[PDB]
Amino acid sequence: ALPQTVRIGTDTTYAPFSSKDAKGEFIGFDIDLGNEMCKRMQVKCTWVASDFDALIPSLKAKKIDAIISSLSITDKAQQEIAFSDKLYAADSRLIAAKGSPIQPTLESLKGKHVGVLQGSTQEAYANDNWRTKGVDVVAYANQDLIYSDLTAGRLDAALQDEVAASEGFLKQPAGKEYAFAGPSVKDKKYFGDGTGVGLRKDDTELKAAFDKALTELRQDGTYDKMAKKYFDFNVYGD
Ligand SMILES: NC(=[NH2+])NCCC[C@H](N)C(=O)O
Ligand code: NA
């Protein structure tokens, strides 16, 4: 027994998953997935923009009903909220200036300024592994601020979801001087297993509804066709 309107929170500074076009309309793979699921659920949905670190608290306060915002399914997150089945895979990777020697290692990063999104898995990773050991880890309200501070030369590097960095910055005008610094950083504990719809633990029926719709759009090929708009690779992963 779902609500008539499902309110979905997202942070719109994470192309190609969630961002705003020139008119301020919400666009991206997340938006397409959410709208497609809502359609199949036969509910109305309202998109709600907010800073990433506000999403889980807004959810718990019932100011939104769901989060679709490249939110990784982690053990930690599941202490607070529930998730749909996996929407797509999301590894983390560092970016730095082209021809930077930088690596995602303590040895490389000590004394350098590294940007992370506040409230993200990447902030947790960097705070635990890098900030404690003397890396200047800087946390930001949103990812656009990070990209800006990076191109302004205030940051040496930045850690975020690999596909967001690549499609949303590196392959975009602002990022032509930049590249990945080292390989993706795999850490089961911190980065979880792909992303999913974030939900209140007790909203069992909403989760089942989302899961049902997600299954169905994967089954009839809609998932792959939508994904093809953004990616020429297997975004879903395993
Ligand atoms: N729309 C966004 N800004 N998403 C950031 C997601 C970062 C990371 N995957 C996390 O779950 O913490
Ligand atoms: Na599947």
From Swiss-Prot:
InterPro entries found in the cross-reference section: Lys_Arg_Orn-bd, SBP_3_CS, Solute-binding_3/MltF_N
CDD domains in the cross-refs: PBP2_HisJ_LAO
In the record, the effect of residue 72 to A is given as: Decreases arginine and histidine binding affinity
Provide the GO biological process annotations.
amino acid transport
Q: Which family does it belong to?
A: Belongs to the bacterial solute-binding protein 3 family.
Q: What does this protein do?
A: Part of the ABC transporter complex HisPMQ-ArgT involved in lysine/arginine/ornithine transport. Binds lysine, arginine and ornithine. Can also bind histidine, with much lower affinity. Stimulates ATPase activity of HisP.
- This protein is called what? Lysine/arginine/ornithine-binding periplasmic protein
The lineage is:
Bacteria, Pseudomonadati, Pseudomonadota, Gammaproteobacteria, Enterobacterales
